[PDB]
Structure 1
């Protein structure tokens, strides 16, 4: 069970301390029970031909709850994350998710010289979808994307993945409205498959901001 604040998760079937770092406070206000809670996002309809999904952080949580208020009222933030991705399948679904948390995922548009705009990057609660997940939509390789902190959801073995993100910045505190540190990237490497139905296994993303700090209240 993963109970932080008021929101709890009774998860029923393994932490990945991202780069071996547990999130601590800055050695500012510290909302410890107001924001440290699982802002469970909408579960995504994972079909067979789904390419992937990306949620930039804290862009995914700028509009949600007490953390969403403390973004649009404060000015800086300092907060690690704890992403609990759970992909509840039966014993008859197959597939593999690379639940990878990419720091500073500067995306790239396909086949144009124009940079991606504000609309193509800052999606929010709805999240994104990989246009070309083999290259992570930044020209790199999915095959080497395990260099980032990651866990595999192999539906043969597990349905869940828990990644504990630290404060990942050169700066001590940064913009939540402009800058997005991490990017929870869930990419189905092996696609979903079962013969009887073109099935769906919804992937629930629950992002608890660990150890929130804030400054600059207006």
Structure 2
């Protein structure tokens, strides 16, 4: 299910805890690898480990030149309906995206090439938004970990 953006080692970040009242997380590229371990590509891998008794849906989607507005770990979104930038969540699928639905599949990876007006030079972001909230019964695990694995390609 390899998706490539617009038809053209392995660093592992921290694990985010998908709670029942989570709103979303976003990471700025390539700032997330500037303290661990210009023209390059990227190969990100978003996967989560949940059982067959949990339900929910995530929406992982890259966003080039994602700027914010005033009201490695990544920040927590405050208003996930407008993404803190005025653009709606429902029209985010015009970007290269992937759906992480807990019923069928537990992996999502996006191939992102270089994209800038100047060939040599924060380029894009990565939003993970819980569209459908997590639901379970009493006694099950209250948190579901979400691991992000980034792999750079052809760095210059």
TM-score w.r.t. structure 2 length?
0.95
Which residue of the other structure, out of 122, 142, 150, is the alignment partner of 1:207?
Answer: 150
Cα distance in 2 for residues equivalent to 1:129 and 1:212: 29
Helix, strand or coil: the match of 1:60? helix
Which residue of structure 2 lines up, in the alignment, with residue 18 of structure 1?
5
CA RMSD of aligned residues (A): 1.1
Shift of 1:198: 6.4
Q: Is it true that 1:95 corresponds to 2:53 in the alignment?
A: no
Structure 2: gaps spanning 5 or more residues: none
1:51-75: CA deviation from partner (whole Å, max 9, x where unpaired): 011011001111111xxxxxxxxxx
TM-score w.r.t. structure 1 length?
0.69
Helix, strand or coil: the match of 1:102? strand
Q: Is it true that 1:51 corresponds to 2:26 in the alignment?
A: no
Q: How many residues align?
A: 155
Paired residues of 1:78 and 1:212 also in contact (CA < 8 A): yes
Which residue of the other structure, out of 103, 109, 114, is the alignment partner of 1:162?
Answer: 109
Q: 1:54-69 to 2 correspondence within 5 Å?
A: 54-65=26-37
Cα distance in 1 for residues equivalent to 2:84 and 2:10: 27
Q: Which protein is richer in strand relative to its size? A: 2
1:138-176: CA deviation from partner (whole Å, max 9, x where unpaired): 1100000011111000001111100010101111022xx
Shift of 1:131: 1.0
Paired residues of 1:193 and 1:199 also in contact (CA < 8 A): no
Which residue of structure 2 lines up, in the alignment, with residue 79 of structure 1?
40
Which residue of the other structure, out of 73, 77, 81, is the alignment partner of 1:134?
Answer: 81
| Larger radius of gyration between Structure 1 and Structure 2 | 1
Runs of 4+ in 1 over 3 A off after TM superposition: none
